[model samples]
Target: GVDLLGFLIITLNCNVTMVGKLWFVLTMLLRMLVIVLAGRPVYQDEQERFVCNTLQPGCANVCYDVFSPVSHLRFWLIQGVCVLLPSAVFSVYVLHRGATLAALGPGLQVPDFSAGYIIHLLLRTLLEAAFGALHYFLFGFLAPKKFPCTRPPCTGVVDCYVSRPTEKSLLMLFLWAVSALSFLLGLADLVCSLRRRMRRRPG
Candidate 1:
């Protein structure tokens, strides 16, 4: 009876777990905080302070342009939406699938999360980890203190100066950490649900 009760508890808990949703909320809130905190003034300052001593028309622009192919906060916002979009779609899909279970047929009660949803979560995990890894490469690892501009028409080493590189690097690393954490959380949640779903064969 002890094992049976434990099985019931595990199965019931697995039926509608909140950890994945909680993890999604955590990642999004962190993303929002990171985005909102990185205000326009900071980005503006970064752009305006990218200086070079050369009088050449396109010298500083070359380095500045290279330094920021895609603006930091803009990319973060896009990443934020990418991360949220799948979950949002899944939320809509599952709840719409919620009302059809035989026991809950009269009205929506417990959500019947299906295999498709589980694989969706796997994809989400892969997406988050990929974004984090790419972000790390972009800003975290090897964030050099200075970048030089020696492109066309510039005869000198024009090191276009940035206002604050370290601070930006720190924020990027922090955001990367959050994504990595969420990736781990998603995997754990996936395994939890996957195992319980498989436990159906034990009966």
Candidate 2:
């Protein structure tokens, strides 16, 4: 009987459960902040900052003419709709229960924190983490690690302008491009889910 009671108590503690949900909401908020603060400003100021300005001329071709603004927009749109907006709504829904107020009074009842909605948040979190990890690893490991040096003939340490291109870099770039597309599609699905939730919400 004690064990059963304990289980019931744990199950009934919606407030505690809501805290865990809040982390996802907060994470989404932070991710959106990055896009708006860093990504958007950099993209707007100079479409060349990330790749062209930072890398070799060969890389500049990819950055300026091939891919820069589109990638920023893709990621910004995805994080905004799928993570940021949904998280904002979910966080509000979890904190208080009068969200479904048309059917009831403007009184606080038990929150309807659906298991399905929680699962969806978990999935988005996983996907975002995976996406970040892939990009981070690609940039960290595969790309030629740049080193600051001065041009001099009587230099003690510095030598040739070392060019070390790895097949891994090429492969990771391809994979990153493909993953970006998938990330966008996943976001589209989340957008539809958001629309449905809004449609179902009460005044």
Q: Output the number of the lDDT-best candidate.
A: 1
Q: Model 1 — TM-score against the truth?
A: 0.77
Write model 2 residue lDDT over 1-203, tens digit each, in one string.
13333333333454333444454455445544555564454335333333222323344343243322244336445644654554455556543443233344332244445544645555765657665674464344354433333222223332222133344255445445544554554555455555766888797
Residue-by-residue lDDT tens digits, candidate 1, 1-203: 13233433343344446886587578767767767766455566776777777886777777787777887678777777787777777666654444233333332233345576687788787787777777767655534567777777788677766777777767767776776677788788888888878887676
What is the clash count of model 2? 0
Off by over 4 Å in 2: 1-18, 21-29, 45-63, 67-69, 73-77, 85-114, 133-203
Q: Residue 117: error of model 1 in Å? A: 2.5
Give every collision pair in model 1.
none
Q: TM-score each candidate.
A: 0.77, 0.37
